[PDB]
Structure 1
Amino acid sequence: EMEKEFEQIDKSGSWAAIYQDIRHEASDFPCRVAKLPKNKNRNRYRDVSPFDHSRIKLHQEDNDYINASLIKMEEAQRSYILTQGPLPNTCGHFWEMVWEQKSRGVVMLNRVMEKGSLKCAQYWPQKEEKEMIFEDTNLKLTLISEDIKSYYTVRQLELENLTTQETREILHFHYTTWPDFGVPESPASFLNFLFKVRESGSLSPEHGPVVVHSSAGIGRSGTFCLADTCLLLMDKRKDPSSVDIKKVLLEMRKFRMGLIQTADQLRFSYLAVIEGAKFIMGDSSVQDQWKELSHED
Structure 2
Amino acid sequence: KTSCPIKINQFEGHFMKLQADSNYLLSKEYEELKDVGRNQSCDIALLPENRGKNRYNNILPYDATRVKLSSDYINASYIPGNNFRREYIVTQGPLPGTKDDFWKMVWEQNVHNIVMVTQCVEKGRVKCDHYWPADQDSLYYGDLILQMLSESVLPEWTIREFKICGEHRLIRHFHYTVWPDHGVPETTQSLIQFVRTVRDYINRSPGAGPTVVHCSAGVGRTGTFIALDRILQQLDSKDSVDIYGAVHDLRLHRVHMVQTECQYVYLHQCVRDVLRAR
TM-score when normalising by structure 1: 0.84
Deviations 1:20-61 (A, max 9, x none): 3321344431111111111001101111111111100001xx
Structure 2 residue matching 1:266: 3-state secondary structure: helix
Q: What number of residue pairs does the alignment pair up?
A: 266
Task: List alignment gaps of at least 5 residues for structure 1.
Answer: 284-297
Specify whether residues 277 and 65 from structure 1 end up closer, same or farther in structure 2 by C-alpha distance, changes over 3 A only. farther
2:54 to 23, 43, 46: 43
Tell me the residue number matched to 1:294.
none
1:7 is matched with 16
> What residue number does 1:68 align with?
76
In 2: Cα distance, 1:244 partner to 1:202 partner: 21
Aligned to 1:219: 220
> 2 CA distance for matches of 1:204 and 1:92?
24
SS at match of 2:159: strand
CA shift for structure 1 position 122: 1.1
CA gap of 1:202–1:116, structure 2 versus 1, over 3 A, is farther
The equivalent residue for 2:139 is 132
Within 5 A, what are the aligned runs for 1:243-262? Answer: 243-262=241-260
Q: Tell me: CA distance 1:103–1:76, structure 2 relative to 1, closer, same or farther (3 Å).
A: same
CA distance, structure 2, for counterparts of residue 122 and residue 25 of structure 1 = 33
The letter of the residue matching 1:10 is: Q
TM alignment of 1:155-174, pairs within 5 A: 155-161=160-166, 164=167, 167-174=168-175
- Give the corresponding residue for 1:231: 232
CA distance in 1, matches of 2:80, 2:201: 21
Alignment root-mean-square deviation, CA:
1.9
Gaps of 5+ in 2: 1-9
Q: 2:30 aligned with 1:19, yes or no?
A: yes
Q: Deviations over 1:140-192 (max 9, x none)?
A: 1111111100111001111111xx2xx21110100111100111121111111
Q: Quick one: distance in 1 between partners of 2:79 and 2:275?
A: 23
3-state SS of 2:152 partner? strand
Query: Does structure 1 residue 82 correspond to structure 2 residue 87?
Result: no
2: CA distance between counterparts of 1:254 and 1:5?
Answer: 25
- Separation of aligned partners in 2, 1:234 and 1:183: 21
